[PDB]
Design a binder for these strands. Sequence first.
RNA 1: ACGGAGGGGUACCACCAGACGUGGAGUCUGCGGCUCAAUCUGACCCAACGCGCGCACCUCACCAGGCCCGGACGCGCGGAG
Length: 84
Amino acid sequence: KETFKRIHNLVTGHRQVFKYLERKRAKICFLACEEKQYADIVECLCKEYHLCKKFTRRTLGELTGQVRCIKVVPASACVIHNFV
RNA sequence: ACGGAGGGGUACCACCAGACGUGGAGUCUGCGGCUCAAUCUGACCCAACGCGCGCACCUCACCAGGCCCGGACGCGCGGAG
């Protein structure tokens, strides 16, 4: 919302969140969506291991650098690996 | 400007007197022609032809074949499901 832009200068996607949710390299989690099999996978993998849910799916597209400025794109993710 | 017009001068890239040569053979090299898929091109009296500073690959354009975008920057659409 404010300093997050500092961080981006984190990941988005199933293939890259799993690859950082496990092995305990992650940080914080923020769920979303369309299908349970993508809602109760991570959540159950959150059951083992931080686990949180942000109110909206779009602001992730906003907070993250998925825009160019105008065309925000939704994208659920839950891995703040960098967290520098 | 030219003159198989005249008069003055001048030079071993002109001559007198001589000397050393080339054109005769074998060979290095370049130039035309023939050949090939290609035998890459410029220059042709003085004022083109060991000259464009040594070509197995690059040099290298030419022939037979094959990799890559190494398409900046703006606008429109899509994109981390």
